[PDB]
Amino acid sequence: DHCARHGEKLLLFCQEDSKVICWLCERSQEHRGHHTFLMEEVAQEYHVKLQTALEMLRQKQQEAETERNQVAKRVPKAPPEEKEALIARGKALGEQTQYMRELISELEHRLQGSMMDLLQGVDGIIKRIENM
Amino acid sequence: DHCARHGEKLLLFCQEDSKVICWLCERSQEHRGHHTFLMEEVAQEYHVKLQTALEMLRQKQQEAETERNQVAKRVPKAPPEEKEALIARGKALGEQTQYMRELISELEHRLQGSMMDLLQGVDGIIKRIENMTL
Ligand SMILES: [Zn+2]
Ligand SMILES: [Zn+2]
Ligand SMILES: [Zn+2]
Ligand SMILES: [Zn+2]
C-alpha cells in the first residue's frame, strides 16, 4: 500500500515502467516524461484489454487441443516417416497449450484481483501475448 | 496540516491562486493549467520579501508615530486657526498608524508561522502593502 522509497500512497501507475508508484516517484527524474495516471483512471481500459485477451486465448487453446487430439488419434494408422513428424507436431502443440495455460492462469488472476494485481507488471504479459 | 478536501499532506503551492494544496489538488481540473510548486521551492523568497516589508513598515510606523506626538505636543500651545488643522493631522496619522499596525501584525503572524501560514494568501498581503504608496 505504501511506496518503499517515500512512504506515500501507492495510487499512481507509470505506463512505461508498468509500475504502481506514489506522487513523489511521479515528480522524480526517474519517471520524467513518463505517462502516469491514477490507477482508477486506467483500470477499466486494462481490464477490458485483458478480458478480450483471455477470451482469444481460451478459444485459441481449445482449437489447438482439438488439433492435438486429432494428431493423437492419427498416429496409429500412419506409416513411420510420417509418424515421427506428427509426434513432433504434437510435441509443439503440447508446448503451445502449456504456454497458453500459464497465460490464461495469469490473466484470470489479474482480472479477479485488486487494481494493483491488475496493473503491476502488466506490460510483461501483454508482450508475452504479442510474442505468440 | 492536511488537505481539507483530500486528507493528503499540504506540501504544494499554486501560484495563480496563492493557495497551499496537495498532490491531488494539483492534478485536478481546477489547477491542472496553473503553475504549481513545492512550498519549499518558493518559501525563501516569500519569507525574505515579507521580512523586508516588515522592516519598511516598522520604519514608516516609527516616523508617523513621532510626527503624531509632535503634533499632539504642539496643539495645546497652538493658536485657534492652527489647532483645527493640527487636530485633523493627528487624526489622519492615527488612521495611518492603525492600518500599519494591522499589516505589521499579519506579517509577524506569517513570518513566525508554518510554511502554510507563510504562503496561504501571501500574494494578497504583498499587493495590499504595495498599494499603500503606489
Ligand atoms: Zn514513491
Ligand atoms: Zn516511470
Ligand atoms: Zn488536496
Ligand atoms: Zn490553482
Numbering used by the authors:
A (entry chain D): 95 to 226
B (entry chain A): 95 to 228
Paper text:
Like all TRIM proteins, TRIM5α consists of an N-terminal tripartite or RBCC motif (RING, B-box 2, and coiled-coil domains), followed by a C-terminal domain. Higher-order assembly of TRIM5α requires the B-box 2 domain, which is thought to mediate three-fold symmetric interactions that connect coiled-coil mediated TRIM5α dimers into a hexagonal net. We therefore engineered artificial constructs – which we call miniTRIMs – that retain the integrated B-box/coiled-coil fold of the full-length dimer but are more amenable to biochemical and structural analyses.
Interestingly, the majority of Bcc miniTRIM crystals we obtained (including three other forms that we did not refine) were composed of dimers. The dimer is quasi-equivalent to the trimer: the same sets of residues make the same interactions but with valence of two instead of three. The dimer buries a smaller surface area per subunit (450 Å2) compared to the trimer. Comparison of the trimer and dimer bonding interactions revealed that the two oligomers are distinguished primarily by intermolecular packing between the Trp117, Leu118, and Leu132 sidechains in the hydrophobic layer. Another distinction is that the first two turns of the coiled-coil helix are overwound and bent in the dimer form, which might indicate some structural communication between the interacting B-boxes and the coiled-coil domain. Thus, the Bcc miniTRIM was predominantly dimeric in solution. In context of the full-length protein, assembly cooperativity drives the B-box into the trimer form, and so the B-box dimer might represent an intermediate state that can incorporate an additional B-box domain to form the trimer.
